[PDB]
Design a protein around this nucleic acid. Sequence first.
RNA 1: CGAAAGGGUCCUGUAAGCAGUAGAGUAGCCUUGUUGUUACGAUCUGCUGAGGGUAAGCCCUCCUUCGCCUAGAUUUC
RNA 2: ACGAGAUUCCCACUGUCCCUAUCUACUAUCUAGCGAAACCACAGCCAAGGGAACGGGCUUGGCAAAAUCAGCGGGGAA
RNA 3: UGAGCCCGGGUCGAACGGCCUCUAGUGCAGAUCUUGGUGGUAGUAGCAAAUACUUCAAUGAGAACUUGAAGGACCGAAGUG
RNA 4: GAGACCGAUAGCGCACAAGUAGAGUGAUCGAAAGAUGAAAAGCACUUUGAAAAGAGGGUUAAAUAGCACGUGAAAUUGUUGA
Lengths: 356, 60, 109
Amino acid sequence: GSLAFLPRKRAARHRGRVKSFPKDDPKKPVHLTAAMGYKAGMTTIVRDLDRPGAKAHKKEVVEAVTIIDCPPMVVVGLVGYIETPRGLRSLTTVWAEHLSDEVKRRFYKNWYKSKKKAFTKYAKKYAENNGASITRELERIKKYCTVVRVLAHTQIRKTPLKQKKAHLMEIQINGGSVADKVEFGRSLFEKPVTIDTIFEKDEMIDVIAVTKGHGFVGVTARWGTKQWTVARAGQMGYHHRTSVNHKIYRIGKGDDEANASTETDLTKKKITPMGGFVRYGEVNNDYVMIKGSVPGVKKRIMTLRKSLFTHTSRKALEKVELKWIDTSSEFGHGAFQTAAEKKQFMGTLKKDLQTS
Amino acid sequence: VNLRTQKRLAASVLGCGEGKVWLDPNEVSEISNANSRQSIRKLVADGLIIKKPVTMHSRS
Amino acid sequence: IADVVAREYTIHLHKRLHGVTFKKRAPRAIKEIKKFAQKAMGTSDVRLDPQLNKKVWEQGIKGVPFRIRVRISRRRNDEEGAKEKLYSYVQAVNVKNPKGLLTSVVEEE
RNA sequence: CGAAAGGGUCCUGUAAGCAGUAGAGUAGCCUUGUUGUUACGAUCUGCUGAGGGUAAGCCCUCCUUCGCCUAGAUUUC
RNA sequence: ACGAGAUUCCCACUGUCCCUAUCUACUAUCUAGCGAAACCACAGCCAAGGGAACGGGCUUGGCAAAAUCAGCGGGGAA
RNA sequence: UGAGCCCGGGUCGAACGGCCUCUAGUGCAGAUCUUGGUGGUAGUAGCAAAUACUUCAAUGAGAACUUGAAGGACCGAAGUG
RNA sequence: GAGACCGAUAGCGCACAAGUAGAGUGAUCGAAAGAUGAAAAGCACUUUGAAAAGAGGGUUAAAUAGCACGUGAAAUUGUUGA
């Protein structure tokens, strides 16, 4: 096996941390870096390839893509860091007024029995002429910090998940003066940020998630067998992984009602498979169609971040043209893309006449 | 209550095995008092103890 | 609302017996029925009719039916210094098919 | 939130029963039958892509029905 | 010609293998009750040095944080 | 100096000591010592096969392995008679 | 009748229902095991417990002597204190 992933222990957290944001210079415009989504499943697409020099040039190729449900994130805070001889240090963070119930659920282990008063005194700071305190923290970030990050949380009431406790993370603000990005973060308070604004089509991203667990496994399946360097039994899976160079093929809007339609096939259909995504449900929000496979089980929190370096391949900066998107059922050997297509093929049934 | 000895004496009185005699579940207290073969014969007449017939078996 | 109430439910034992070893399906079905009444009626004291044991064991140790239609009746346990004031008694009902039936309340009148 | 139910999606492959002289074949009635009749009759066909199963680690629920709820115990600057 | 005799060759088959994957039952696991034995100077981290190719206690370095659960077989003359 | 000697406090209930001679079955860490008792290991290893058990009631302080009834299995006259 | 003997792992194997219990086909082999209190005065009665027992109350000079009974060391163990 590989000694670069040697401490094969369970991840300390279920969310997964970025661990590196792309290097910042003030010349680029102000932008965000990362976002969160929920893994929905996989589907098959047909792509009109435009790869000069390849055997499949000017031909149709069938590829596997993964769907990540991406409801808009709400910006509810701002954090500032300073450079020290001991690394980066958090100087102060400025929260927004009027936090939602979901983001407060993250702060509690027993939300149902609690007297929900998180940030109750902090809200009075805004509205009781202690706005000097809020501005003093904002000015402190401007004149002392070198990196400013945004606290954004998901909206899982839109996600078909039984979990009600949202997910917080810090997203770095890159490309600008420290003063410019602080005004950027304050203006984003209490506001939803959509995925098509953070990323876009035919760009290559990195995804961070915790892998599927397998429990106690022996040497045959853990280390791949035909001291610290000797294969042993232990935990396999549930490991933090950072996969890079995954191309976004499509960003769906959710309100389009024709998300899975292309310029080639004129079928008004959404991305959700016939009968729903197996073990997940229906994607009713913005979604990111990522090529290939991505670490994590279905309905697992998914961390999307930008590439740390400018790309060196023609796989990037190449246009992606879609011909057809599969929507047939994943619960079996499906053969119908729409409910209408099934009824047209089989005619009318005994129950159809009895009801009518 | 324990009715093991009533089961044995009923088998001898009725002339069959232990598995073919039936003691009334609703009259366990009366049967428990019955500890003599004369008394069990009274319970047999009263219907509280019954000999079950042979098991049916279709030859055809 | 009342402490004494009788209702009829359908129990999907196929859901609760999936994957179980064959030589344990009938005993497991009896335990699942008790758990069903212990949670539907909130009583730890659940008594099953002997003919309910008949219906579960109709088809051998591994032939428990997929759907069983029972009646659970919460009664009062008077006794003398009983640990639980209420008890639930479960019976099998006679229906043409144990499918398509909703939860219903029976009336003593 | 839970249990049912309805719908969808999948799996199998056309349920029990009834009916059609379609039906090979097995037998009675009277007298010859050139088209005589009466019964049984494996099988075939129709009702019937029906019937059965469907989350247990599939999906949805507009009042689809029924029920549960602000606990009780310990510890903590 | 004969032989549960041996060998070679030919046809056929095979998870033997390329290269593994899946499934079932009893264990392994946790609980209630019951409940031993082997063995035991005292202990138990590593490296270099400790003339008698001998170290476990010395030297002088690396170090070094309570209490635990599961896996293993590395160490304990002619 | 030491082997040891003396006193105080607690427990206990019936005999004992100092001096000087006599006498010996007279002084223990070892003997894979003898007898007796007690530890760590340890609430650990482990508590096997004979397909298979389930429901209500009774007894009883206490019921998986005690009884009655009912169900599901078995020996199958070379038997689990 | 005595002893510069032994004093319950000693003295005979046996201070006791000891050549007994027990082992072996048999010839034979062969143990362990003494002590309440001067006197049973061996705890009436009440209460909790299914019971075994516990707690009050009592006998006694003493229960720090309750028949697992004179005195009651160490190994080993519990609680409390540091």
